[PDB]
Design a binder for this molecule. Structure first.
Ligand SMILES: CCCCCCCC(=O)OC[C@H](COP(=O)(O)O[C@@H]1[C@H](O)[C@H](OP(=O)(O)O)[C@H](O)[C@H](OP(=O)(O)O)[C@H]1O)OC(=O)CCCCCCC
Ligand SMILES: CC(C)CCC[C@@H](C)[C@H]1CC[C@H]2[C@@H]3CC=C4C[C@@H](OC(=O)CCC(=O)O)CC[C@]4(C)[C@H]3CC[C@]12C
Ligand SMILES: CC(C)CCC[C@@H](C)[C@H]1CC[C@H]2[C@@H]3CC=C4C[C@@H](OC(=O)CCC(=O)O)CC[C@]4(C)[C@H]3CC[C@]12C
Ligand SMILES: CC(C)CCC[C@@H](C)[C@H]1CC[C@H]2[C@@H]3CC=C4C[C@@H](OC(=O)CCC(=O)O)CC[C@]4(C)[C@H]3CC[C@]12C
Ligand SMILES: CC(C)CCC[C@@H](C)[C@H]1CC[C@H]2[C@@H]3CC=C4C[C@@H](OC(=O)CCC(=O)O)CC[C@]4(C)[C@H]3CC[C@]12C
Ligand SMILES: CCCCCCCCCCCCO[C@@H]1O[C@H](CO)[C@@H](O[C@H]2O[C@H](CO)[C@@H](O)[C@H](O)[C@H]2O)[C@H](O)[C@H]1O
Ligand SMILES: Nc1ncnc2c1ncn2[C@@H]1O[C@H](COP(=O)(O)OP(=O)(O)NP(=O)(O)O)[C@@H](O)[C@H]1O
Ligand SMILES: *[C@@H]1O[C@H](CO)[C@@H](O)[C@H](O)[C@H]1NC(C)=O
Ligand SMILES: CCCCCCCCCCCCO
Ligand SMILES: CCCCCCCCCCCCO
Ligand SMILES: CCCCCCCCCCCCO
Ligand SMILES: CCCCCCCCCCCCO
Ligand SMILES: CCCCCCCCCCCC
Ligand SMILES: CCCCCCCCCCCC
Ligand SMILES: CCCCCCCCCC
Ligand SMILES: CCCCCCCCCC
Ligand SMILES: CCCCCCCCCC
Ligand SMILES: CCCCCCCCCC
Ligand SMILES: CCCCCCCCCC
Ligand SMILES: CCCCCCCCCC
Ligand SMILES: CCCCCCCCCC
Ligand SMILES: CCCCCCCCCC
Ligand SMILES: CCCCCCCCCC
Ligand SMILES: [Mg+2]
Length: 1046
């Protein structure tokens, strides 16, 4: 995180690099800083340094722009704007100028921002736009085509053009152009799918200190400027603190869930505007405002707080544009693999140079042949194969209805070994059923009431009717499902005239019915709502203040989790057997929410939910979705660990885990309960063995106590723990972080608004109730069920196998072609000119692009894909396949030598001037069929991929190439002219060649099958490793020798 500043000699450095002609590799290597400094006009003075290099320990360089009003030196890094302060000499982030600003200051910013201050803050903070520039086509060409690989391909094109191999040069050019086009299309789509999301362009009203009215574009906003919000509704131009009125918004673009959320005006007072503690008082960029009410004045006034990239949406966009490096390695071993391949290539080109020197050839031709061989070693289709494989996988996922912002994470799904779920919404149905309400008398519960409609007028009925954040939107109430079903159960239909405190936020009317019963005593009267305190998952609570045409004083009603609410209630109002009866309902799997009240003596949220008194419990059913038990059973069958992380009660979570199969029968479960220290001793960490493998379940506060007071025992709990309950979102992301610390590949599926942090922290985050692509999590599904989890895993495995099948095959292709030409070099032939074109484009490129189209296996398995190219089976398969191919080619050559008809090539004339000569044709035919054979063999089916005959384009390609090659052998000759073949004029020997290559086909398949069948057993019997690289496996073993809980 160190920034170093540096100010005719640069042209000298450029000329030196050009003369060297490969200085870019040195500057793209361990010593890039030295070259940069030598070619940057070094000058440490930051005030004068126009260039700055930042190191984050990784190495980035950026200019220093200067904007004038007088002078302002700023620079952009990672999308964030930093500016230079003359009074400090250092660089400070734009977001940190107005840090610690007090809420009273935000309120005093109610008045306008003058045009002078507007332009000053415009120059400082820049325009209010999340800038994702559109790249001109030549910019993309210079960005992508400029790299060592394509430069080497251009060199190969030049070299093969030098020796009159026009066709081969042209086809290499075509392959490179196709690869560049595919990379460009991938990058363009990647930029466009993000740019289309941040498209905010609309006029907004803002009031000046004088005139108090002006319409400006969304980009013309700056921090500290007020904003008149549109009461009809619409998108939010930028991040602003709500200063006046109330707002109903739909912030699904950065939260996942699409339920309405209530934002109340910022509470006036002294203290910093955190923007995270006041999250309920802030409107975020790119969020739809369902409505905005004033209740105190003409307009709903907000104050712009942060604009541009520093907004939360801007931060997520910045993360997407510059993602963090992947923690889990995918290969991290290809250096040794390509080193071994290069070793083989060098041992081959040594033979090439030696045998060429053996015969009479000019030294220039000798070096030309050597460089030709080296160019043939490198295949030009590798980047195209990678890109098309990734595009195919992403298209498959999109066709299944799952969208990934950046497909680079797809392969992570192929090596997930732990998946977290949240109970409500994802595992269970979103909706709820109100089973009933349990009331109190003064300190003793009463029988459950099925329909709350039949309650008498009193605190409980009023609390059920009034305590929520429901709002009518187009003749339909909307809000939390819990609140909607509760109010439906009561029947009190949602409907100025301030009673005591302020203007009423809402009014409720009791349903007219029972002329005798309802008016039997105190007929119901409508109830007005004065103050509302929205619900937040961090504090399991919601407080409302209400009055009615009676109401000698107002009344505050609090709805919350039973444990926390009972803690807040008056101790003598809570019955002694609260815990057991709550278990009696939660152990049955019911969601239970407590209602309490206090009569206010005629307002910050703290003084409301204080000396409360229990009114009752609300028991409501919540059933598992019908496609969660099979998914959990499949995941557990494949030894993929499944964990529940939820903010609900521990008893309900345990019951749901038992029902959905996370805790199958005959699997003992313990409850871990750590008591907070009471100033006499630490937590005891009590264990309660439950009654119908080892499983542990613990709530949020005990999890925090274990984290902060038993660090030694934390790994064992995390390894054995499966059901975590009553966790705040912060605790959820903390648990994900801890699981990752144990070297787990942690994926997660979540509903919204309490999983966003955990979803982002997770290696593979999935959001369910999302219409389309979102910046909420790396992956997002359209359908709402857990079934998306296995497919993302399966495709990932299908990718990991598929990628390997490319690196294998194109390596085989890289080297099976390498040996063939060497054989010809030993006989002084050079494999023809159009023959190279036939080998590459007709046969190889089409197969390489088509082989990755195959889909996933449609079922999971316990066998994980490999994680290294240089494993024993892979290298063994490569070597044995090379032995088979070399044997076939040499046998063909030796048999062709041993025929009645034969005339050796005229060795005194260099190729291609001696073609077809009866040796080039046979080697070429064998090589072509060998490429097809290798392609067919490398492309496996089970357990990860479908059988080869699934993707009908690839199978059709294989069939057509085989047919045209067979024709090329079994005809008097139709392409033998252009391909320079000698037209073997007998119908007997060519049939023998066909039989021999059939034997080669059979040999390759039997070889690969025998390897797959036998080598794993040999490795199990031979080298008994006892893997301990990952800490969680070590902990699993240690628990296996002896469990920690007795
Ligand atoms: C000249 C040889 C040069 C090559 C040197 C590199 C050899 C080489 O990478 O293989 C390492 C593996 C060890 O095994 P390795 O591949 O390192 O296996 C590791 C474990 O499997 C680990 O946990 P568990 O799943 O619990 O086992 C996890 O899977 C890691 O990810 P990964 O599996 O996805 O890659 C692996 O790194 O196999 C040897 O133990 C051969 C050692 C050399 C044999 C020498 C014979 C002469
Ligand atoms: C034994 C002899 C006669 C053969 C040597 C072959 C050279 C002519 C090859 C070897 C490496 C090649 C270079 C490999 C990499 C590049 C990088 C490329 O520039 C970049 O894309 C770098 C961008 C970056 O990473 O910042 C331009 C072509 C060039 C210089 C290549 C030009 C041709 C080079 C010097
Ligand atoms: C050392 C002499 C005696 C050998 C003569 C042949 C060399 C000119 C060959 C040997 C190794 C070859 C290199 C082998 C591998 C690569 C990797 C290849 O991939 C990349 O480095 C780019 C990857 C990316 O940009 O993502 C670029 C060409 C290059 C440097 C090759 C350029 C030509 C080299 C230097
Ligand atoms: C006989 C010689 C001239 C061989 C020429 C090779 C072609 C047959 C290859 C070159 C590029 C290939 C295409 C490259 C990319 C795709 C995208 C792929 O679809 C996607 O992954 C993107 C979907 C979307 O975003 O719409 C389907 C295969 C296809 C059409 C490939 C089909 C085969 C093509 C045309
Ligand atoms: C110069 C003459 C001798 C060339 C004659 C063409 C043949 C070499 C044929 C045999 C196999 C054919 C390929 C077989 C299958 C396809 C599938 C199809 O490509 C796709 O994969 C489309 C994907 C989709 O949209 O679903 C159309 C072109 C292509 C690559 C064909 C291109 C032409 C090939 C290479
Ligand atoms: C004397 C014989 C000398 C030859 C010795 C053998 C050398 C073999 C070198 C093989 C190079 C492998 O190269 C590996 O694949 C391709 C090459 O473009 C690169 O691929 C990279 O660029 C492409 C786009 O161009 C991206 O889509 C891909 O995501 C990215 O990783 C890999 O980053 C590189 O690591
Ligand atoms: N709308 C609400 N008003 C008041 N209390 C609520 C509301 N919704 C949930 N709660 C309570 O808050 C507790 C935890 O809140 P949250 O963690 O937001 O709910 P959850 O549905 O248990 N979460 P999860 O299971 O991870 O989706 C729940 O157990 C309820 O007791
Ligand atoms: C092969 O070409 C060379 C050209 O020099 C010459 O020997 C002769 O014309 C041809 N045939 C034989 C057998 O050499
Ligand atoms: C002889 C060359 C054969 C091609 C080998 C390709 C292997 C690349 C593996 C690493 C890819 C990610 O960097
Ligand atoms: C890759 C294999 C390289 C070795 C090729 C040797 C060819 C010898 C053929 C000439 C001897 C038969 O008359
Ligand atoms: C395997 C096919 C190799 C490419 C063949 C290119 C020749 C096409 C036929 C041209 C006919 C006119 O000469
Ligand atoms: C893509 C290749 C198609 C055009 C190839 C033309 C070949 C010309 C060779 C002429 C000599 C043999 O008649
Ligand atoms: C990139 C090099 C392209 C060369 C074009 C070749 C066209 C065929 C002509 C072959 C006989 C001169
Ligand atoms: C739905 C399967 C699509 C198959 C694509 C067409 C394959 C035949 C193409 C033949 C071209 C020569
Ligand atoms: C990571 C950039 C790799 C550049 C190619 C290095 C080739 C070195 C040959 C000695
Ligand atoms: C499932 C393995 C498929 C084997 C058949 C390969 C294609 C044969 C083309 C004649
Ligand atoms: C379902 C059994 C396998 C079907 C084979 C279809 C492809 C045959 C041509 C090789
Ligand atoms: C996707 C299922 C494919 C079934 C096999 C198709 C065989 C067709 C031979 C042309
Ligand atoms: C799925 C039906 C189409 C299968 C392709 C049949 C072969 C066509 C040769 C072009
Ligand atoms: C369909 C491909 C086989 C056709 C060959 C017919 C003539 C063979 C006698 C040379
Ligand atoms: C595979 C194509 C077979 C063509 C007919 C074979 C005739 C051979 C007579 C010995
Ligand atoms: C007796 C000469 C060989 C007859 C053909 C052998 C079978 C060919 C398999 C492709
Ligand atoms: C998948 C096993 C394949 C068995 C060998 C096929 C030989 C077919 C000759 C055309
Ligand atoms: Mg949920």
């Amino acid at each position: 995180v160190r920034l170093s500043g540096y100010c005719w000699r640069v042209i000298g450095y450029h000329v030196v690099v050009w003369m060297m002609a490969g200085i870019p590799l040195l500057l793209f290597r361990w010593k890039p800083l030295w070259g940069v400094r030598l070619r940057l006009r070094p000058c440490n003075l930051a005030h004068a340094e126009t260039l700055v290099i930042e190191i984050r320990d990784q190495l980035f360089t950026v200019q220093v722009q200067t904007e004038a009003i007088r002078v302002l030196r700023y620079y952009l890094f990672q999308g964030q704007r930093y500016i230079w302060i003359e009074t400090q000499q250092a660089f400070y982030q734009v977001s940190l100028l107005d840090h610690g600003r007090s809420c009273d200051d935000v309120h005093r910013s109610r008045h306008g921002l003058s045009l002078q201050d507007q332009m000053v803050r415009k120059a400082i903070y820049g325009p209010n736009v999340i800038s994702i520039p559109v790249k001109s086509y030549p910019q993309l060409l210079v960005d992508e085509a400029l790299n060592p690989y394509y430069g080497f391909q251009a060199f190969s094109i030049a070299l093969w053009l030098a020796d009159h191999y026009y066709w081969y040069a042209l086809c290499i050019f075509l392959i490179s152009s196709i690869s560049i086009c595919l990379s460009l299309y991938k990058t363009r789509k990647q930029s466009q799918t993000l740019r289309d999301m941040v498209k905010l362009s609309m006029r907004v009203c803002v009031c000046r200190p004088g005139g108090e009215e002006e319409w400006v574009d969304s980009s013309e906003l700056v921090p500290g400027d007020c904003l008149v919000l549109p009461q009809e509704g619409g998108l939010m131009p930028c991040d602003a603190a709500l200063v006046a009125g109330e707002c109903m918004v739909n912030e699904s673009s950065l939260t996942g869930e699409s339920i309405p959320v209530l934002k109340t005006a910022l509470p006036e007072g002294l203290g910093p505007y955190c923007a995270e503690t006041h999250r309920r008082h802030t409107l975020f960029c790119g969020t739809l405002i369902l409505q905005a009410r004033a209740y105190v004045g003409p307009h709903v006034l907000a104050v712009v707080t942060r604009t541009g990239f520093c907004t939360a949406k801007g931060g997520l966009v910045s993360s997407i544009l510059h993602p963090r490096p992947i923690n889990f390695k995918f290969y991290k071993h290809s250096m040794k693999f390509v080193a071994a391949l290069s070793v083989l290539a060098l041992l081959g080109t040594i033979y090439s140079i030696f045998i060429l020197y053996r015969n009479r050839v000019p030294l220039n031709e000798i070096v030309i042949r050597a460089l030709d061989l080296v160019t043939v070693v490198v295949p030009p289709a590798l980047p195209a194969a990678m890109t098309v494989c990734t595009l195919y996988a992403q298209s498959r996922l999109r066709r299944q209805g799952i969208f990934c912002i950046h497909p680079l994470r797809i392969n992570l799904g192929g090596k997930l070994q732990l998946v977290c779920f949240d109970k409500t919404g994802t595992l269970t149905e979103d909706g709820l059923d109100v089973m009933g309400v349990v009331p109190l008398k003064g300190q003793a519960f009463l029988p459950l009431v099925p329909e709350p409609r039949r309650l008498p007028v009193g605190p409980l009925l009023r609390a059920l009717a009034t305590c929520h954040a429901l709002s009518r939107l187009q003749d339909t109430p909307v809000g939390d499902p819990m609140d909607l079903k509760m109010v439906e159960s009561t029947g009190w239909v949602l409907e100025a005239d301030s009673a005591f405190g302020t203007q009423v936020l809402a009014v409720m009317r009791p349903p007219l019915w029972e002329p005798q019963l309802q008016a039997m005593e105190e007929p119901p009267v409508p109830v007005s709502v004065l103050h509302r305190f929205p619900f937040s998952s961090a504090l399991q609570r919601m407080s409302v203040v209400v009055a009615w045409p009676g109401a000698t004083q107002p009344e505050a009603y609090v709805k919350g989790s039973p444990e926390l609410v009972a803690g807040l209630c008056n101790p003598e109002t809570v019955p002694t057997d609260f815990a057991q009866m709550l278990q009696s309902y939660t152990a049955a799997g019911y969601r239970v929410v407590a209602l309490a009240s206090k009569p206010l003596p005629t307002l910050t949220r703290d003084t409301v939910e204080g000396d409360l008194s229990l009114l009752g419990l609300l028991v409501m059913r919540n059933l598992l979705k019908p496609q969660t038990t099979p998914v959990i059973q499949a995941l557990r069958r494949t030894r993929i660990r499944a964990v529940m992380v939820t903010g609900d009660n521990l008893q309900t979570a345990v019951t749901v885990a038992r029902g959905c199969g996370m805790v199958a029968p005959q699997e003992h479960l313990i409850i871990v309960h750590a008591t907070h220290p009471e100033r006499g001793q630490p937590a005891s960490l009590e264990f309660l063995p439950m009654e119908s493998s080892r499983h542990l379940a613990l709530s949020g506060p005990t999890f925090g106590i274990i984290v902060k007071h038993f660090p030694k025992l934390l790994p064992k709990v995390l390894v054995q723990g499966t059901v975590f309950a009553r966790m705040a979102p912060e605790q959820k992301t903390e648990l994900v972080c801890e699981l990752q610390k144990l070297q787990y590949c942690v994926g997660m599926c979540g509903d919204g608004a309490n999983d966003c942090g955990a979803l982002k922290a997770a290696d593979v985050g999935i959001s369910l109730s999302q219409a389309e692509a979102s910046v909420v999590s790396p992956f997002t599904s359209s359908m709402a069920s857990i079934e998306c989890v296995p497919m993302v895993i399966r495709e990932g495995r299908c990718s990991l196998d598929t990628s390997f099948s490319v690196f294998k095959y194109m390596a085989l292709y890289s080297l099976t072609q390498f040996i063939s030409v060497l054989i010809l070099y030993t006989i002084n032939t050079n494999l023809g000119d159009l023959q190279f074109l036939a080998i590459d484009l007709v046969i190889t490129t089409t197969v390489a692009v088509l082989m990755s189209r195959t889909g996933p296996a449609l079922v999971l398995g316990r066998v994980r894909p490999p994680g290294a190219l240089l494993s024993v089976p892979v290298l063994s398969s490569l070597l044995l396949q090379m032995v088979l191919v070399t044997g076939v080619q040499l046998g063909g050559y030796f048999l062709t030598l041993a025929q009645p008809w034969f005339v050796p090539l005229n060795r005194t004339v260099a190729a291609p001037d001696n073609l077809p000569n009866y040796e080039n044709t046979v080697v070429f035919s064998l090589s072509s069929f060998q490429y097809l054979i290798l392609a067919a063999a490398v492309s496996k089916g089970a357990p990860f991929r479908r059988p080869l005959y699934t993707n009908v384009p690839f199978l059709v390609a294989l069939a057509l190439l085989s047919s045209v090659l067979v024709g090329l052998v079994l005809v008097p000759g139709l392409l033998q002219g252009p391909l320079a073949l000698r037209n073997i004029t007998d119908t007997g020997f060519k049939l023998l060649l066909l039989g021999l290559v059939t034997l080669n086909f059979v040999g390759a398949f039997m070889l690969e099958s025998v390897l797959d069948q036998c080598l794993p057993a040999c490795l199990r019997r031979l080298r008994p490793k006892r893997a301990s690289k990952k800490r969680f496996k070590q902990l699993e073993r240690e628990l296996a020798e002896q469990p920690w809980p007795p």
